[PDB]
Amino acid sequence: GVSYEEFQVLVRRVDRMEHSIGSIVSKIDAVIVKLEIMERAKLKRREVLGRLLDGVAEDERLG
Amino acid sequence: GVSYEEFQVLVRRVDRMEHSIGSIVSKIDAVIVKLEIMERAKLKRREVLGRLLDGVAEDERLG
Amino acid sequence: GVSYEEFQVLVRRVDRMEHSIGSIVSKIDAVIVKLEIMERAKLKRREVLGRLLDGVAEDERLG
Fold this sequence. Notes:
The structure is a homotrimer. The first copy, chain A, is mostly helical. The first copy, chain A, has a single domain (1-63), classed as Single alpha-helices involved in coiled-coils or other helix-helix interfaces. Chain A is built from one helix and no strands. Chain A has one helix at residues 4-62. The termini of chain A are far apart. The interface between B and C is medium-sized, with 15 and 17 residues.
């Protein structure tokens, strides 16, 4: 013996949970895409600075 | 024809899921606040080291 | 008055949500373990480069 109102209460909770899960998935996904934008930016930065240091080494010895 | 016990089983599953969603939201949020504490700390670190390098350049040329 | 079919519809939604929550938990957890693998790798890298710089300082003054 379960009434519609009892049932509807559970449906509304599930509706809000489904909306929270949508938001959470979007948030975790954005974290993951941002962490890779950061990782890519980092490797490039270390290479660019690496090339400047190659230049300091060459000038120190031959300049 | 749905019995209370059938229904109650679904309510208990939803209760545990709601608790998992609370924990997940707290976890994702902590990740995001920590990543910004890290990002801020990083920019400061690069600036502080940048100022020491400015000092090496000045001393190398005028010391 | 709630029919099994009405109820079953909510059970299937809850089943898919439970599967999404499992996936989300695995994803957030992997983010957290990866961020620590990265943090550990970083401290080691700064120490190793720190030791090379100690070497440049010593050679500059005594070489």
